[PDB]
Structure 1
Amino acid sequence: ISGGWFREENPGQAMSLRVEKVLYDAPTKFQHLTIFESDPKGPWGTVMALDGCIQVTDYDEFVYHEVLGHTSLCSHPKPERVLIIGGGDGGVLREVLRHGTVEHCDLVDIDGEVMEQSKQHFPQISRSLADPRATVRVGDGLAFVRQTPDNTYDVVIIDTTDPAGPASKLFGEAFYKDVLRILKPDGICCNQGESIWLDLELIEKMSRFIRETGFASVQYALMHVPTYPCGSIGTLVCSKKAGVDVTKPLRPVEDMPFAKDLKYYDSEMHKASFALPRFARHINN
């Protein structure tokens, strides 16, 4: 409520944001969705949470959306067809659609209410959802990839909630076999790759099963997000083709017309993301 504290806890730590006004707080068909304006004496703006876990804020949203969208597309030689699983807020889709190469993007999120509330309360995040290059569907991403042809996509971006709720299977090897299949030979996959502080064991598990399922290479890109647990998150950037080094940008964004509208990502930051703290560096070898 106004003057209280949205508190995110799931051990012995919580990140909290002061509330100015609650805009929406209700059950969807799948999740508990909350949207509030945080204290205007702070920089956060409007905040969206799902099942108690912060998803986007006005002040820092650009980080994760730019890192997912551009690290993957600038690693691809000519990304024309893209799939986003999850991503119902539209942020990754806004970034992907900056690229002049993209002809079509399909976005599939299980919760149609996330798209609706993002259109109502996060116009700068959701502008993309109406673009005629995108087909936006309500549905489970695991079912979607199981109905999708081999060799459909240049890039697949898995922008999901954590393993504990409706995204559970999207962190498993069966799903990843299907993502490898629906990618074209030169395809790239990236995901919501979780934390090196909280989820190191899961990142090592997934990096190994993704490689073993048939991806030629898998590297974790670390990013700074103040409102995600412990202040960061990462993405596993995976290449179907051997001999690809996703840690150096193949097509640097500085050669693109929208490079100077980005707030976080550029080529120095792309290369820097793959340097990991010594305790974690074995992820990237």
Structure 2
Amino acid sequence: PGSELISGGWFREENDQWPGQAMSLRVEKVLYDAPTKFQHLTIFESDPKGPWGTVMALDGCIQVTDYDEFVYHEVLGHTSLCSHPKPERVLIIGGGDGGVLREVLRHGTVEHCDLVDIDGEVMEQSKQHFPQISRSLADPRATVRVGDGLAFVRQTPDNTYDVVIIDTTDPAGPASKLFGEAFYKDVLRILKPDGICCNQGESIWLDLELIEKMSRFIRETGFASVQYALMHVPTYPCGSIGTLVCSKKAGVDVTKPLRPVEDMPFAKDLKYYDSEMHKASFALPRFARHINN
């Protein structure tokens, strides 16, 4: 999908990844619509009568809106770092909008974070059109690279990172191999012994089979535990998205915060996450419970 999804004054998120349905947002003004070296990227201002603000899509899939971006950025950044006893070195694969990095960089334990995203235009357009999301990209604790995540992890030493956050687009497109076992084996390797990873873990309404397959192979590759956390995101298909939160060490329970954010100075700045939302996120509907046991 590309430009054709902006039609009759609406962006219509039709995709064969979710046949028969489409979330639609009304378009006030298209700001940017262009092929990049890897994806089709569309940025528009939504109807000022509604709350969504600026919207970004990649290959026809809504990625961020001003209104709800905080949810997924806070969940991935804090569920993973508050599960880690001292997260000092962090990798973000994908993430070129800067939102997960903004949250990671709230933590005073972080010494460095690498962020590697295949598509340098996402960083550029995020700087221009989403300054509250992309401010973080310039921080000297970060090294921001344009490149493929799979090649990057293949060149990375053993035991490099305390946390890896895999903040990718859906499987159709350049993120395809980042949902595969060979990538996860590398993520396990580049984590330190107390390492934690988490990802963009898709929808229990549309992708339950892929989430089953992934949780299985991630455990089989050698992660000691894998728990899926659900969160409320209106502008992801069916209104929620989840993250598989994976511990390299045994006997770790990522479902209860190890280092609670309320004991951190920035707790009251967050709009979604806290420790009760952390715990609640791992309670799954009975039809999906088997992901977590």
Equivalent residues in 2 for 1:241-256 (5 A)? 241-256=249-264
Q: Please report how far the alpha carbon of residue 184 of structure 1 lies from its aligned counterpart in structure 2 after TM superposition.
A: 0.1
CA contact (8 A) 1:204 1:283 kept: yes
User: CA-to-partner distance for each residue in 1:135-156, whole Å, 9 max, x for gaps?
Assistant: 0000000000000000000000
Residue 17 (structure 1) aligns with: 25
CA–CA distance in structure 2, aligned partners of residues 37 and 234 of structure 1: 27
Q: Please report how far the alpha carbon of residue 2 of structure 1 lies from its aligned counterpart in structure 2 after TM superposition.
A: 9.7
Residue 158 (structure 2) aligns with: 150
CA contact (8 A) 1:107 1:137 kept: yes
Q: Please report how far the alpha carbon of residue 9 of structure 1 lies from its aligned counterpart in structure 2 after TM superposition.
A: 1.1
Residue 3 (structure 1) aligns with: 8
Residue 190 (structure 1) aligns with: 198
The equivalent position to 2:277 in structure 1, one of 261, 266, 269, is: 269
Residues 2, 206 of structure 1: CA spacing in aligned structure 2 closer, same or farther, 3 A cutoff? closer
Q: Please report how far the alpha carbon of residue 5 of structure 1 lies from its aligned counterpart in structure 2 after TM superposition.
A: 0.5
Residues 226, 30 of structure 1: CA spacing in aligned structure 2 closer, same or farther, 3 A cutoff? same
CA–CA distance in structure 1, aligned partners of residues 27 and 181 of structure 2: 39
CA–CA distance in structure 2, aligned partners of residues 163 and 12 of structure 1: 19
User: CA-to-partner distance for each residue in 1:54-98, whole Å, 9 max, x for gaps?
Assistant: 000000000000000000000000000000000000000000000
CA–CA distance in structure 1, aligned partners of residues 14 and 253 of structure 2: 37
CA–CA distance in structure 2, aligned partners of residues 72 and 52 of structure 1: 28
CA–CA distance in structure 1, aligned partners of residues 135 and 265 of structure 2: 19
Residues 116, 243 of structure 1: CA spacing in aligned structure 2 closer, same or farther, 3 A cutoff? same
CA contact (8 A) 1:19 1:39 kept: yes
User: CA-to-partner distance for each residue in 1:163-211, whole Å, 9 max, x for gaps?
Assistant: 1110000000000000000000000000000000000000000000000
The sequence identity of aligned pairs, in percent, is 100
What CA RMSD, in Å, does the superposition of the two structures yield over aligned residues? 0.8
User: CA-to-partner distance for each residue in 1:24-54, whole Å, 9 max, x for gaps?
Assistant: 0000000000000000000000000000000
CA–CA distance in structure 2, aligned partners of residues 41 and 220 of structure 1: 35
Structure 1 gaps of 5+ residues are none
CA contact (8 A) 1:2 1:19 kept: no
CA contact (8 A) 1:38 1:47 kept: yes
Q: Please report how far the alpha carbon of residue 215 of structure 1 lies from its aligned counterpart in structure 2 after TM superposition.
A: 0.2
CA contact (8 A) 1:150 1:183 kept: yes
Q: Please report how far the alpha carbon of residue 3 of structure 1 lies from its aligned counterpart in structure 2 after TM superposition.
A: 7.0
Q: Please report how far the alpha carbon of residue 280 of structure 1 lies from its aligned counterpart in structure 2 after TM superposition.
A: 0.3
Equivalent residues in 2 for 1:1-285 (5 A)? 4-10=9-15, 11-285=19-293
TM-score (normalised: structure 2): 0.96
Secondary structure at 1:9 match in 2: coil
CA contact (8 A) 1:68 1:190 kept: yes
Secondary structure at 1:118 match in 2: helix
CA–CA distance in structure 2, aligned partners of residues 26 and 164 of structure 1: 18
TM-score (normalised: structure 1): 0.99
CA contact (8 A) 1:2 1:20 kept: no
CA–CA distance in structure 2, aligned partners of residues 55 and 12 of structure 1: 20
CA–CA distance in structure 1, aligned partners of residues 8 and 130 of structure 2: 22
CA–CA distance in structure 1, aligned partners of residues 40 and 125 of structure 2: 12
CA contact (8 A) 1:2 1:21 kept: no
CA–CA distance in structure 2, aligned partners of residues 16 and 178 of structure 1: 37
User: CA-to-partner distance for each residue in 1:226-270, whole Å, 9 max, x for gaps?
Assistant: 000000000000000000000000000000000000000000000
Residues 203, 236 of structure 1: CA spacing in aligned structure 2 closer, same or farther, 3 A cutoff? same
CA contact (8 A) 1:3 1:20 kept: no
CA contact (8 A) 1:2 1:22 kept: no
Q: Please report how far the alpha carbon of residue 284 of structure 1 lies from its aligned counterpart in structure 2 after TM superposition.
A: 0.3
Across the two proteins, how many residue pairs are aligned to each other?
285
Structure 1 stretch 5-14 or stretch 81-90: which is displaced more? 5-14
CA contact (8 A) 1:254 1:266 kept: yes
CA–CA distance in structure 2, aligned partners of residues 45 and 271 of structure 1: 30
CA contact (8 A) 1:82 1:104 kept: yes
Structure 2 gaps of 5+ residues are 1-5
Secondary structure at 1:145 match in 2: helix
